Design a protein around this ligand. Sequence first.
Ligand SMILES: *[C@@H]1O[C@H](CO)[C@@H](O[C@@H]2O[C@H](CO)[C@@H](O)[C@H](O)[C@H]2NC(C)=O)[C@H](O)[C@H]1NC(C)=O
Ligand SMILES: *[C@@H]1O[C@H](CO)[C@@H](O)[C@H](O)[C@H]1NC(C)=O
Ligand SMILES: *[C@@H]1O[C@H](CO)[C@@H](O)[C@H](O)[C@H]1NC(C)=O
Ligand SMILES: *[C@@H]1O[C@H](CO)[C@@H](O)[C@H](O)[C@H]1NC(C)=O
Ligand SMILES: *[C@@H]1O[C@H](CO)[C@@H](O)[C@H](O)[C@H]1NC(C)=O
Ligand SMILES: *[C@@H]1O[C@H](CO)[C@@H](O)[C@H](O)[C@H]1NC(C)=O
Lengths: 121, 211
Amino acid sequence: GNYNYLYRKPFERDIYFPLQSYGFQPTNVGYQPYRVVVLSFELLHAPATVCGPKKSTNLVKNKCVNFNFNGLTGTGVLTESNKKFLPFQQFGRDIADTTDAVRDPQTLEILDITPCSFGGV
Amino acid sequence: AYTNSFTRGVYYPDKVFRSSVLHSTQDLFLPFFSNVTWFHAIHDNPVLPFNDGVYFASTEKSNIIRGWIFGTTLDSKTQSLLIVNNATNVVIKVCEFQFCNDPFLGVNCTFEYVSFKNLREFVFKNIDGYFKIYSKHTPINLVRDLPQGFSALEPLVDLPIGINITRFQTLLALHAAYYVGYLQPRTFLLKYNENGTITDAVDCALDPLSE
Ligand SMILES: *[C@@H]1O[C@H](CO)[C@@H](O[C@@H]2O[C@H](CO)[C@@H](O)[C@H](O)[C@H]2NC(C)=O)[C@H](O)[C@H]1NC(C)=O
Ligand SMILES: *[C@@H]1O[C@H](CO)[C@@H](O)[C@H](O)[C@H]1NC(C)=O
Ligand SMILES: *[C@@H]1O[C@H](CO)[C@@H](O)[C@H](O)[C@H]1NC(C)=O
Ligand SMILES: *[C@@H]1O[C@H](CO)[C@@H](O)[C@H](O)[C@H]1NC(C)=O
Ligand SMILES: *[C@@H]1O[C@H](CO)[C@@H](O)[C@H](O)[C@H]1NC(C)=O
Ligand SMILES: *[C@@H]1O[C@H](CO)[C@@H](O)[C@H](O)[C@H]1NC(C)=O
């Protein structure tokens, strides 16, 4: 078969001796070759740079809105803010882990998120 | 030679803004008041173990220290990380290098990336095949050595290289002084100020008052 295909921490790479070769022949189902792609998604709080086809709206300020920034879905009154985000930081967090401020992905300004007005009746 | 690190080698643990808060974090940090091995860029470029990860720093006036080598055997039997600054530029490679007998910069590459007066501080660590670089740069008033007092390092570069590291070395530009300290898995408590900035820290395992 196609013996040009061979086998041997997380995301470890390593290049009797260790290699063995697959006998991939069309006559082989479990003994047949399969291709595999593994997609790893880097969620981390830097700027996003691989995003879905979902089209951006305009921005809205000083009014309660059902926002989404880079997949960060939420609801609140968005307002301009004085928070000095360092260049590597995209989001800011509350004591409760809930996002308290964001940097917008298209214009690099910083918004506070304030939850919409509420109380007991 | 040797010196003591004092309150140095803290870095921002994640890319999240925080302010007016004391935040606990557990990570590979340089321990407070630890020893660091000291070397002189004058009159010194040996191989070093890497262990869990490395703080590296240089006190400078002429830019002699310009890069690093990392890997396991450093002998072309495996892929090995090379990092270099060349004036205006940064270049990074992972080839199966057969390195020089005494590495200096003259005044399968499965991955590639491109882009005393002062203290330069760096942190290097390898996690899940990613190699992570943090740094800070400052003028200094102390002529001799690492300064006492507190400052924090920021993430600059993060590379998905998929390579093992247990030895490293530093690269001199040839025809100042430099420092090495191993990180440890430590809990730190970090004071984020009103201006989003880490401005104080406690290494919890330093002493009973720190606990
Ligand atoms: C990373 O490289 C080191 C060698 O520098 C590997 O450590 C050796 O591991 C084998 C078992 O696999 C032991 O017999 C040796 O005694 C180890 N040597 C040392 C110096 O510790 C290590 O296994 C490699 N790790 C990964 C995740 O690839
Ligand atoms: C990205 O979008 C903003 C408007 O949302 C615009 O000001 C900016 O110039 C755009 N950048 C590029 C490179 O087109
Ligand atoms: C620091 O290193 C010196 C030798 O250079 C040693 O005598 C001393 O005990 C060490 N101190 C600590 C805190 O490890
Ligand atoms: C740095 O080195 C690269 C090749 O490694 C080269 O393309 C670049 O022009 C160099 N820049 C300087 C300032 O030497
Ligand atoms: C690249 O890796 C292969 C094994 O996959 C090895 O046979 C070859 O000699 C290596 N070539 C270079 C230039 O490092
Ligand atoms: C915070 O920033 C202001 C300027 O925006 C500055 O005047 C003040 O001294 C800073 N305070 C601290 C503790 O860094």
